[PDB]
């Protein structure tokens, strides 16, 4: 019954969850760029 | 055809048939390796090699495997064959071998002799009558092409 | 700029000198008979050295067949390749079992800047007149200037 | 001159005048600083005399050389290391196809016996690369490394930086200071930690500069070079005195290409002072002389400054001195320009603009000269010097000759494949033929925008183009879209190799909602799903609704990123419209027979056969055969009956008759020859077009044909490529890109690192023919097929694995060579 | 100005008929009716107005007219259009207009 | 002369050579000029007219503003224009 | 293969979204790449396998069947088995069904020549003179159904099915399992009339001196997709109207 | 300004040494290079006082300290060669 009311009201039940997993791989990209700095330069220089 | 199994089997076959027939020591055959350029057209392979063998016969040129990055060390033991990577104009090529290995134990070999060894079994009257109709057909095919 | 580009899977070892000796002998052999290198030239002396820097026992057997069966009757550059080849065959037998050597034979070139009468600036790095080898170059290095 | 160990009797040590400092001097440190020592500098030069008249040995020397780009000092020492026998790591910060084929050429000419050269990608501004590259030089081959131990290091790498003043020290200067200094020391500091043996020193060769800030605007360049001089004193003070021995070279004025081409004009000027500059082969010679075995022992007790600056420290204010010499040659060049510009126009004013047009010459534009060129017939008295007394011996009715030939390849036809094969470059005649077949240029005739025109016009914009603008506009695109390249989805009906479509059988667990369909399709669903679906008629329309119920099987589509992304395409834009195949036969027939029809005409054309019926003037109709054949051909029509029919896609009704291998030879007969000669069809996988010659020749010599076609052809498709992947025959394209291989170089015969072949498509045909009928027609005898063979190898259980059954083309009996055979002698058989 | 609207205009004033009376599909030869000085004058006017006249302009219809001012009849009113305009306006157009 | 401007243009290759025909006023005595021209091109006397230089020849003979040509080169759509004219 | 119930698939565009079904890791990534936006995948963190929902607008392939015409064909007799001739169950489970018919036919054709062992030729002839110029018309239809029809469904298929699809590979298993010769292998392929040209290629192989013994043959197999395409060319007779 | 670094040999040039080389050199020059761009007047020079060292690598294990100090000596010759001869006048002290 929950899916057919969300179908009626045009409510996406996973719009928050699809945007959650799409920013979680987007913040994994900048993390993959951020540790390229610390692997290259080191922890004392970065601090 | 760029595989581990072929290029030592093809190399050992040309080495062992030129060993058995009495080549002079120090006369390798020049290995040309067209599939770097054209790829392996699996059914069409021997034709592109036989077109190349005739082009090599007329020009006397020997093309080069221009992706011979480093020829395999296991191929130094095959002394009766040479592996160019650079195009080299020779002063005349008498005959060319064309070997093709297939799936299902399907090997093959052509030998492509230069046309001038045909044009010396026929006398002076036949040749100079022949060369006219060729020069006639060449201009006629020129206009068609 | 700091994005690391090294990977061990991309290394390109270059080894097979045994091929490039048997190539550059016969690559030199048609540069002689087609006149693209005379015996007065200095790059034929550069690449006679690079062959005897790569001498194997089978490379002489490679060279000696091409010099014994070089036809002298075909021309006068065919006289040249048999003479210049056999002189290299006699040299590759001696440098065999010795350590390959770096002998640079490049002709010493210095700068000459001349301005055209129209006003163009052209740089010709011409051959030195008094310093023609590195034998004479080191003698220049001792004199100061 | 060619006629090796010349002895020296008067060395260069005795040649040095008193009071005169040489151009190349080794220095020795005292308390005051560095100054000239004659003993070390004479030991230097006497080695360089012997390095010139005799030469240098570098055998079993393991060197690292960084900064070795094409046309530098660091690439002219690599010719001198590798010529001596060294074992060099080479670093490239740019890794390409043109980069490594420079280094392959440099090894193919200079690679002395024992030498190896290794090209690695390497960033030196990366700390993570300098950690990982000494782990590649020192680790063992069982862990992936090399197992070397470096006996010299030459870290020359730098950034070109200019215009960076002190107020503009920018991020390119902070990255150049890291490359040249703060990670050069980490490069020498990492070869230290990988050494465990105090008996192997590694001679560091440091490119010092004599110009520490005496020039102007270069950024942190002088601050990078002046702090490499503190590795002299640090050898004494730290614990690497036996690990790294420092030998700093002070490279003087080097005259080379690159960004110093604005400085070559004044090298003549400062040489007039009594100073000398250097070419790159000279500072090749000058740093390789720091590797002589007498300097090498001298570096192991002393840090060695080698001031190879050729007297340039004896010039006061070198910045202001070379500034006025560069100004005066620029101020002489323009006053001689602007006068000769004004004196040119002042003669245009007096003598008039009608006259000066007759002062310029009319240059000739060149065109292409596409000929046909049958092979050049020699004269008959010349033909018997090539072949001696062979006259009247062979019967010409029993010699088979190839009289014409053609292709449809990845490089076009037999002419433009040979230009890419023999030369690597197209001609002007072969670049308008690849522009013709790829459909870039179309020959316009008639009126073009009012004016009459007859010439080559583009196909995209339709504007007139001169024949030399064919290369200059299209050689970039002809080369980019032809040959071995990555599979383009437009050529294979939407086949994206990265998105290979597959279907997954899914058992439904909750029933779909009803969808409306037609009459017979709903009866087809209910028969073929059974109980697990419902159908109900709409009486208002007559079409049925069908509901798929719980438990029925669906087929859900899927895709997968597939490995093989590169194959050797027929060139993109090749079209059978442009040869004259009607759009009737285009829309019927499978794509491979388009490649066979195109190949058959221009192979007959290669034989001077402008019309296929010209044989029948000389031969009977029942004597023109077609013994050609394919390996697997028809894969596009086997995809029709097996893959496209099961989906009930709209398919041609008679697709099965073009799936055959003997049906491409039908369309040659149905559309060209109309003959009755021996049709055959070989099918021996890869090697099928050489047995097509074999079936071809014994067809002729038996007398069953006098003309016969001989050919091979196959096509690339999706489902044929995936099944060579699982047999592991074609190379994985993705793991070729981890190896840094471009598509035009991962088809690698004979190679140490070959990984499988590169699959291609197209055709190839030869019109073979008896020798006497060839010279009775007057066709170009291109070849003489002396031998042909086929052979089956040996008992096995592995079909793709090759064998040696064809070694029995050379079988003969050598048990008794006491008698030479009489029959091999040419004069014995002639008198018989 | 376009070729189609150019030829028609000039021809309309030559035949003294309504602009619709002259269908651009046909040819001047068949449009005139047979007059030796009729067809000659028609082409003459256009000949000096454009310059680009084919071998058989009398037979060239529809496409012929369009081709005449094709890769050529660029936007210029020509003398024919100029003379006619200047004359008519100063002979019929109100005084001063 | 404007036909011979195609013959130098056809038989030279990748060169940018200056012409043997700088000014059309050289054609006022052709028989000594044509021989000296065709000794620079011996291959022109043996290669037939190209088809690209054949429909060019027909485009020269029917060019506007020219005197009509004193011969007929083709039996084509344009025969009477070549004939009676 | 039931000829009365020939299975086909129909492409159906979904108009109301299916409910989510659970699948594995890489298959859910295969669905999302190959359906794109029109499906969802979500990880079950308790198990590591994903759920996938097919959304509105994605294309399914619904199975169907149709009563097909051609119900009669000339079968190898029901119960024929290559076990009973001595072919090992190694070669049974690898190889396409038609080469089973060629191996069976090759021994008892040599047996018809008094050749109890295939190596009895080599006492009289050289190994490079025992040819095999046999060949098929279309043979390998069961392995062409493997790479084209069975692979697209990702059915569990033999990895090297393409090397038994060939027409020159049935003559390989004659050489790999019987003859071990080096004579002239050829392979004709002239549709219907292919085993009479196999004689033709056979005889001029012998009279040229290239072989002294050569096999000569023809063989082909009946399958579903080969029978349907002779129906649309109207070559095989409609069985229902018979 | 400087960093105390010690025990950093050539095999142990570490991240505290890459940060000390930036403090002492590659951002000391940016400090003198930024007072240049904020000056507009050639009549006011700014006397740079550089803490040079007389011990360029003659001690042992200090990291990039001697490479930071020896390349401040190239500001003597760079005064002549660049366009800040009237903006920054260099006066290097060699502290014993």
Swiss-Prot record, chain D:
State the disulfide connectivity: none
**Name of the protein described by the UniProt record:** Fatty acid synthase subunit alpha
Organism for this UniProt entry: Candida albicans
User: What is known about its subunit structure?
Assistant: [Alpha(6)beta(6)] hexamers of two multifunctional subunits (alpha and beta).
Span within the full-length protein is 581 to 1450 of 1885
Task: Write the gene name.
Answer: FAS2
Where's the active site on this chain? 686 (for beta-ketoacyl synthase activity)
**Family to which this protein belongs:** Belongs to the thiolase-like superfamily. Fungal fatty acid synthetase subunit alpha family.
- Role this protein plays: Fatty acid synthetase catalyzes the formation of long-chain fatty acids from acetyl-CoA, malonyl-CoA and NADPH. The alpha subunit contains domains for: acyl carrier protein, 3-oxoacyl-[acyl-carrier-protein] reductase, and 3-oxoacyl-[acyl-carrier-protein] synthase.
Per UniProt, residues of the Ketosynthase family 3 (KS3) domain are 503-832
Curated annotation (Swiss-Prot), chain F:
The job of this chain, per UniProt, is described as: Fatty acid synthetase catalyzes the formation of long-chain fatty acids from acetyl-CoA, malonyl-CoA and NADPH. The beta subunit contains domains for: [acyl-carrier-protein] acetyltransferase and malonyltransferase, S-acyl fatty acid synthase thioesterase, enoyl-[acyl-carrier-protein] reductase, and 3-hydroxypalmitoyl-[acyl-carrier-protein] dehydratase.
Note the subunit structure.
Answer: [Alpha(6)beta(6)] hexamers of two multifunctional subunits (alpha and beta).
Q: Which family does it belong to?
A: Belongs to the fungal fatty acid synthetase subunit beta family.
Query: What is the designated name of this protein?
Result: Fatty acid synthase subunit beta
Which species is this record about?
Answer: Candida albicans (Yeast)
Curated annotation (Swiss-Prot), chain H:
**What name is this protein filed under?**
Fatty acid synthase subunit alpha
Can you state the subunit structure given in the record?
[Alpha(6)beta(6)] hexamers of two multifunctional subunits (alpha and beta).
Q: Which residues form a coiled coil?
A: none
Q: What does this protein do?
A: Fatty acid synthetase catalyzes the formation of long-chain fatty acids from acetyl-CoA, malonyl-CoA and NADPH. The alpha subunit contains domains for: acyl carrier protein, 3-oxoacyl-[acyl-carrier-protein] reductase, and 3-oxoacyl-[acyl-carrier-protein] synthase.
Identify the segment of the full-length protein shown. Answer: 775 to 870 of 1885
Q: Where is the signal peptide?
A: none
User: What species does this protein belong to?
Assistant: Candida albicans
Query: In which family does this protein belong, per the annotation?
Result: Belongs to the thiolase-like superfamily. Fungal fatty acid synthetase subunit alpha family.
């Amino acid at each position: 019954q929950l899916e057919v009311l969300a179908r009626y009201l045009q409510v996406d039940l996973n719009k928050g969850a699809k945007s959650f997993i799409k920013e979680k791989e987007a913040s994994a990209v900048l993390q993959k760029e951020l540790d390229l700095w610390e692997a290259e330069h080191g922890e004392f220089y970065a601090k | 055809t760029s595989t581990v199994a072929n290029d030592k089997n093809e190399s050992a076959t040309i080495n062992n048939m030129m060993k058995h027939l009495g080549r002079s020591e120090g006369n390798p055959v020049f290995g040309v390796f067209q599939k770097y350029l054209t790829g392996h057209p699996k059914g069409a392979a021997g034709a592109w090699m036989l077109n190349g063998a005739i082009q090599i016969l007329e020009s006397g040129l020997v093309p080069g495997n221009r992706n011979a990055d480093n020829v395999d060390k296991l191929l130094e033991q095959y002394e009766y064959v040479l592996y160019p990577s650079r195009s080299i104009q020779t002063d005349g090529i008498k005959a060319v071998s064309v070997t093709s290995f297939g799936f299902g134990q399907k090997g093959a070999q052509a030998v492509v002799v230069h046309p001038d060894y045909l044009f010396a079994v026929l006398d002076r009257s036949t040749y100079e009558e022949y060369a006219t109709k060729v020069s006639a057909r060449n201009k006629k095919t020129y206009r068609y092409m | 700029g700091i994005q690391p580009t090294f990977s061990a899977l991309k290394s390109r070892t270059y080894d097979s000198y045994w091929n490039w000796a048997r190539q550059d002998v016969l690559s030199m052999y048609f540069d002689i008979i087609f006149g693209k290198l005379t015996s007065v030239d200095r790059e034929t002396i550069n690449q006679c050295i690079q062959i005897m820097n790569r001498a194997n026992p089978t490379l002489i057997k490679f060279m000696q067949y091409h010099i014994d069966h070089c036809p002298e009757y075909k021309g006068e550059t065919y006289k040249l390749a048999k003479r210049l080849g056999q002189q290299l065959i006699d040299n590759c037998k001696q440098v065999l079992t010795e350590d390959p050597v770096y002998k640079d034979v490049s002709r010493i070139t210095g700068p000459k800047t001349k301005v055209s009468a129209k006003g163009n600036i052209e740089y010709e790095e011409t051959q030195k007149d008094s310093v023609r080898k590195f034998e004479q170059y080191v003698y220049e290095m001792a004199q100061g200037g | 001159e060619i006629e090796d160990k010349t002895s020296i009797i008067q060395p260069v040590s005795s040649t040095i005048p008193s009071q005169t400092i040489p151009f190349l001097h080794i220095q020795k440190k005292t308390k005051d600083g560095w100054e000239y020592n004659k003993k070390l500098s004479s030991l230097y030069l006497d080695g360089l005399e012997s390095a010139a008249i005799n030469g240098l040995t570098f055998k079993d020397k393991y060197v690292l050389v960084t900064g070795a780009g094409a046309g530098s000092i660091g690439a002219e020492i690599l010719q001198g290391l590798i010529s001596g026998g060294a074992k060099v790591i080479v670093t490239t910060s740019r890794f390409s196809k043109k980069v490594t084929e420079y280094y392959q050429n440099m090894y193919a000419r200079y690679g002395a016996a024992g030498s190896t050269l290794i090209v690695v990608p390497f960033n030196q501004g990366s700390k993570q690369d300098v950690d990982a590259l000494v782990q590649y030089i020192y680790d063992e081959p069982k862990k992936g490394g090399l197992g070397w131990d470096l006996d010299a290091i030459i870290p020359f790498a730098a950034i070109p930086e200019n215009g960076n003043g002190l107020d503009n020290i920018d991020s390119k200067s902070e990255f150049a200071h890291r490359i040249m200094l703060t990670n050069l020391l980490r490069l020498l500091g990492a070869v230290k930690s990988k050494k465990t043996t105090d008996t192997r020193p590694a001679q560091c060769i440091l490119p010092l500069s004599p110009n520490h800030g005496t020039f102007g605007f270069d950024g942190l360049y002088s601050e990078s070079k002046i702090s490499l001089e503190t590795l002299f004193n640090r050898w004494y003070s730290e614990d690497w005195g036996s690990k790294l021995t420092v030998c700093g070279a002070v490279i003087g004025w080097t005259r080379g290409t690159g960004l110093m081409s604005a400085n070559n004009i004044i090298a003549e000027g400062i040489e007039k002072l009594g100073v000398r500059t250097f070419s790159q082969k000279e500072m090749a010679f000058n740093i390789l002389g720091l590797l002589t075995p007498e300097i090498v022992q001298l570096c192991q007790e002393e840090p060695v400054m080698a001031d190879l600056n050729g007297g340039l420290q004896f010039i006061d204010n070198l910045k202001d001195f070379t500034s006025k010499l560069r100004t005066d040659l620029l101020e002489t060049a323009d006053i001689r320009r602007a006068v000769s510009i004004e004196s040119a126009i002042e003669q245009k004013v007096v003598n008039g603009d009608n006259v000066d047009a007759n002062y310029s010459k009319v240059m000739v534009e060149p065109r292409a000269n596409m000929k046909f060129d049958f092979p050049t017939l020699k004269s008959y008295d010349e033909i018997k010097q090539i072949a001696p007394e062979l006259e009247g011996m062979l019967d010409l009715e029993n010699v088979v000759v190839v009289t014409g030939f053609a292709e449809v390849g990845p490089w076009g036809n037999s002419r433009t494949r040979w230009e890419m094969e023999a030369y690597g470059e197209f001609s002007l005649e072969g670049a308008i033929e690849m522009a013709w077949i790829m459909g870039f240029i179309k020959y316009h005739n008639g009126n073009l925008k009012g004016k009459p025109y007859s010439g080559w016009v583009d196909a995209k914009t339709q504007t007139p183009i001169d024949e030399k603008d064919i290369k200059s506009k299209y050689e970039e695109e002809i080369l980019e879209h032809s040959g071995i390249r990555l599979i383009e989805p437009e050529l294979f009906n939407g086949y994206d190799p990265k998105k290979k479509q597959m279907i997954q059988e899914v058992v439904v667990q909750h029933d779909l909602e009803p969808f409306e369909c037609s009459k017979e399709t709903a009866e087809q669903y209910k028969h073929e799903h059974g109980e697990k679906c419902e159908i109900f008629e709409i009486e208002e329309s007559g079409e049925y609704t069908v509901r798929i119920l719980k438990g029925a099987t669906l087929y859900v589509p899927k895709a997968l990123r597939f490995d093989r992304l590169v194959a050797g395409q027929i060139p993109t834009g090749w079209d059978a419209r442009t040869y004259g195949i009607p759009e009737d036969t285009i829309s019927q027939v499978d794509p491979i027979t388009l490649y066979v029809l195109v190949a058959t005409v221009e192979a007959l054309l290669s034989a001077g056969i402008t019309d296929p019926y010209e044989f029948y003037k000389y031969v009977h109709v029942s004597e023109v055969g077609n013994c050609s054949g394919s390996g697997m051909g028809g894969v596009s029509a086997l995809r029709g009956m097996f893959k496209d029919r099961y989906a009930d896609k709209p398919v041609q009704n008679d697709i099965l008759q073009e799936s055959f291998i003997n049906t491409m030879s039908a369309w040659v007969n149905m559309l060209l020859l109309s003959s009755s000669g021996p049709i055959k069809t070989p099918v021996g996988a890869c090697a099928t077009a050489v047995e097509s010659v074999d079936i071809g020749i014994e067809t002729i010599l038996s007398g069953k044909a006098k003309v016969v076609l001989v050919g091979g052809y196959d096509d690339f498709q999706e489902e044929g490529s995936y099944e060579f992947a699982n047999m592991n025959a074609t190379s994985n394209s993705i793991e070729e890109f981890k190896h840094g291989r471009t598509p035009k170089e991962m088809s690698r015969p004979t190679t140490t690192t070959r990984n499988g072949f590169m699959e291609a498509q197209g055709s190839g045909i030869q019109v073979i023919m008896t020798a006497d009928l060839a010279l009775k027609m007057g066709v170009p005898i291109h070849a003489v097929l002396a031998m042909t063979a086929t052979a089956t190898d040996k008992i096995g259980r592995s079909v793709p694995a090759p064998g040696k059954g064809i070694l029995t083309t050379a079988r003969e009996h050598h048990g008794n060579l006491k008698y030479p055979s009489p029959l091999l002698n040419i004069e014995y058989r002639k008198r018989q | 100005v376009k070729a189609n609207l150019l030829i028609h205009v000039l021809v309309a004033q030559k035949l003294k008929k309504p602009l619709d009376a002259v269908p651009m599909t046909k040819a001047i030869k068949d449009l005139v009716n047979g007059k030796s000085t009729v067809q000659n004058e028609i082409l003459g006017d256009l000949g000096k107005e454009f310059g680009s006249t084919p071998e058989k302009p009398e037979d060239t219809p529809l496409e012929e007219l369009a081709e005449q001012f094709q890769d050529s009849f660029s936007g210029q009113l020509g003398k024919t259009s100029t003379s006619l305009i200047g004359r008519l306006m100063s002979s019929k157009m109100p005084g001063g207009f | 002369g404007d036909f011979l401007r195609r013959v130098e243009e056809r038989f030279t290759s990748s060169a940018g050579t200056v012409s043997l025909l700088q000014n059309f006023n050289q054609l006022n005595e052709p028989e000594q000029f044509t021989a000296d021209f065709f000794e620079k091109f011996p291959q022109a006397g043996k290669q037939l007219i190209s088809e690209e230089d054949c429909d060019y020849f027909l485009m020269l003979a029917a060019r506007p503003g020219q005197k009509p040509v004193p011969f007929v080169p083709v039996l084509d759509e344009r025969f009477e224009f070549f004939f009676k004219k």
